[PDB]
Amino acid sequence: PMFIVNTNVPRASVPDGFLSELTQQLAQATGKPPQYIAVHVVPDQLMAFGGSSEPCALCSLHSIGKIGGAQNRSYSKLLCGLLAERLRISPDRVYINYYDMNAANVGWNNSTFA
Amino acid sequence: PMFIVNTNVPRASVPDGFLSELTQQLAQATGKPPQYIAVHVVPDQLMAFGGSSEPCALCSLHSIGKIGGAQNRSYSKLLCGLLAERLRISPDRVYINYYDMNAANVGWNNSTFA
Amino acid sequence: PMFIVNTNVPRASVPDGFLSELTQQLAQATGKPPQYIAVHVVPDQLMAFGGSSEPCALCSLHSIGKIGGAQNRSYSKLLCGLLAERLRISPDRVYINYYDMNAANVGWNNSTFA
Numbered sequence: 131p132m133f134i135v136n137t138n139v140p141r142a143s144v145p146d147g148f149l150s151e152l153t154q155q156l157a158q159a160t161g162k163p164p165q166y167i168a169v170h171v172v173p174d175q176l177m178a179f180g181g182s183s184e185p186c187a188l189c190s191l192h193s194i195g196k197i198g199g200a201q202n203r204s205y206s207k208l209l210c211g212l213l214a215e216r217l218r219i220s221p222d223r224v225y226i227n228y229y230d231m232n233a234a235n236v237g238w239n240n241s242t243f244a
Numbered sequence: 245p246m247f248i249v250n251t252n253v254p255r256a257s258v259p260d261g262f263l264s265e266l267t268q269q270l271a272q273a274t275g276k277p278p279q280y281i282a283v284h285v286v287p288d289q290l291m292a293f294g295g296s297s298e299p300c301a302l303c304s305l306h307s308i309g310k311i312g313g314a315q316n317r318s319y320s321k322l323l324c325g326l327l328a329e330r331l332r333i334s335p336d337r338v339y340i341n342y343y344d345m346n347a348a349n350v351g352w353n354n355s356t357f358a
Numbered sequence: 359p360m361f362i363v364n365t366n367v368p369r370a371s372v373p374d375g376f377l378s379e380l381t382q383q384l385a386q387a388t389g390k391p392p393q394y395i396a397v398h399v400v401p402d403q404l405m406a407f408g409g410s411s412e413p414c415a416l417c418s419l420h421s422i423g424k425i426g427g428a429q430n431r432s433y434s435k436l437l438c439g440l441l442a443e444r445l446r447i448s449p450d451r452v453y454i455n456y457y458d459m460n461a462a463n464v465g466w467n468n469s470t471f472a
């Protein structure tokens with residue numbers, strides 16, 4: 131799985147250990163080994179949410195499976211929780227787009243997962 | 245809805261008020277309240293279009309519905325218009341990818357929109 | 359088509375001519391004329407892969423068509439190969455998401471491709 135967070139929160143406000151925390155928590159939540167988890171955080175972004183420049187985030191979670199109604203609610207609670215605790219972003223100022231990727235459409239190590 | 249612009253135009257060339265303008269114009273065009281519109285501009289990017297580094301943009305519009313043939317033509321005229329007027333990017337050096345998101349695949353406020 | 363690479367490799371390690379090489383090699387591989395190819399490279403990123411901050415990349419390739427089982431395998435071999443040679447990224451630390459875009463969902467030059 132791959133999780134990306136784009137935020138206007140400044141780099142200095144991203145705490146040490148945040149990528150490792152996301153890796154671990156996402157491994158746990160998706161039921162996958164951590165070796166499969168990639169995380170990417172992009173601070174200092176020029177963004178607004180509802181026209182306000184208050185802290186906000188625009189994120190994506192891509193996975194081969196483990197995406198669906200209930201699962202996505204559970205990921206959103208987990209992820210908005212981390213963003214609120216660590217980056218002081220209100221959950222109502224977070225959007226997370228979820229993508230169920232087909233194995234044939236994910237490249238890795240010179241091939242795909244198909 | 246969420247609109248992202250990645251461009252090689254420099255940060256100083258993004259006018260003050262641009263994120264607000266995009267928010268308002270997209271609220272109008274989508275017919276959704278502005279509280280739901282998120283906008284994200286990423287200048288100073290290492291980019292080419294057609295092998296040239298003249299000003300260009302790579303953009304994305306995600307919406308739960310309000311995506312389709314005619315709508316997307318209208319959005320493209322609107323958004324290329326804004327990018328040409330405000331950032332001086334030629335419409336033929338803009339790509340916009342449109343995504344009709346399922347409500348279950350959009351996380352917000354600890355849950356999803358399903 | 360549009361190809362994006364996000365990486366923790368520093369900007370100074372991205373060689374001159376990398377965007378042009380990606381453009382040409384993508385045109386070779388997809389068959390699309392080089393005038394239609396857009397490329398975007400984002401270095402200096404805060405990312406991890408498998409919980410490690412060794413060199414890695416998260417990429418995307420969007421195209422109207424020219425996406426599928428065998429094509430995507432071939433793109434991955436190509437693109438991992440370029441990343442390894444030019445940016446010294448191990449192929450097993452690269453993910454590439456492939457998107458077959460509907461023509462109605464790609465804006466350009468004030469309209470869409472539908």
Ligand SMILES: CS(=O)(=O)Nc1cc2occ(NC=O)c(=O)c2cc1Oc1ccccc1
Pocket residue numbers: 359360390394395420421422423461464466471472
């Ligand atoms: C890069 S692409 O993946 O978005 N595809 C294309 C990009 C293009 O850009 C410029 C064009 N004309 C003048 O410039 C095009 O006609 C054009 C066509 C593209 O492909 C198709 C293939 C079948 C149906 C619809 C579109």
